[PDB]
Amino acid sequence: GDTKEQRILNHVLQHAEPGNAQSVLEAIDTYCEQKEWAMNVGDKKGKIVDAVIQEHQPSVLLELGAYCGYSAVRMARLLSPGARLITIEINPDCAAITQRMVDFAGVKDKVTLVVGASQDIIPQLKKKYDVDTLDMVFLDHWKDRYLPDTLLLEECGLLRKGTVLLADNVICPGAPDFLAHVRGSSCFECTHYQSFLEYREVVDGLEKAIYKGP
Ligand SMILES: C[S@@+](CC[C@H](N)C(=O)[O-])C[C@H]1O[C@@H](n2cnc3c(N)ncnc32)[C@H](O)[C@@H]1O
Ligand SMILES: O=[N+]([O-])c1cc(O)c(O)c([N+](=O)[O-])c1
Ligand SMILES: [K+]
Ligand SMILES: [Mg+2]
């Protein structure tokens, strides 16, 4: 047998142009639109993600929740040389697929995949992964981790003035306690981007929360 994630990877390996990141993204989106839905950020919201990367030019980017590597590829393809994306994924099998997806897309030099929980890995980023501070963080893992991982990042001293937090799904499935914290707090400048749930007409949005310092 096989899983949906293997089926998404199979489709890419069989239909996308090796080494072409845009091709990989289109192959994934077309499969998911036409065959089976999957929780990739997708093309519509992906464009908003692209604009934030192009606007902030992060050199150290952290991703929470990699899944099949769609957003990893989507973001890594826009990064300058020497820039690095660190992506954390709790599921080893998804991490295996993400790694292959990133290899096939031609952006493996930009990506550092870590297998483990965000809450476990975040306190190790300075000692084990040579991070000083993060330039940007994409939050797209289980929504109940959004707030406590944000607080962890802050407490571990990983945020600096101008650090960009970008969170998917803040409307659907939703991340209300995260939104309340960053929107109510004097330590964050927030912007909401309304859009649509990936592959659907259900309304969703992302939240951009710029850390203003402690
Ligand atoms: C929505 S998918 C990520 C999709 C990816 N960002 C994209 O757009 O292509 C959610 C992922 O986060 C992972 N996840 C959930 N909780 C996590 C945690 N605490 N630490 C790391 N990964 C987690 C899940 O296993 C799943 O692969
Ligand atoms: O259920 N969904 O439609 C989604 C969508 C998403 O974009 C998700 O990131 C998600 N999740 O991580 O739980 C779930
Ligand atoms: K605020
Ligand atoms: Mg999502």
Curated annotation (Swiss-Prot):
Extracellular topological domain: 1-214
PTM text: The N-terminus is blocked.
Reactions performed catalytically: a catechol + S-adenosyl-L-methionine = a guaiacol + S-adenosyl-L-homocysteine + H(+); 2-hydroxyestrone + S-adenosyl-L-methionine = 2-hydroxy-3-methoxy-estrone + S-adenosyl-L-homocysteine + H(+); 4-hydroxyestrone + S-adenosyl-L-methionine = 4-methoxyestrone + S-adenosyl-L-homocysteine + H(+); 2-hydroxyestrone + S-adenosyl-L-methionine = 2-methoxyestrone + S-adenosyl-L-homocysteine + H(+)
Cofactor remark: Binds 1 Mg(2+) ion per subunit.
Disease: Schizophrenia: A complex, multifactorial psychotic disorder or group of disorders characterized by disturbances in the form and content of thought (e.g. delusions, hallucinations), in mood (e.g. inappropriate affect), in sense of self and relationship to the external world (e.g. loss of ego boundaries, withdrawal), and in behavior (e.g bizarre or apparently purposeless behavior). Although it affects emotions, it is distinguished from mood disorders in which such disturbances are primary.
Family assignment from sequence similarity: Belongs to the class I-like SAM-binding methyltransferase superfamily. Cation-dependent O-methyltransferase family.
Descriptive protein name: Catechol O-methyltransferase
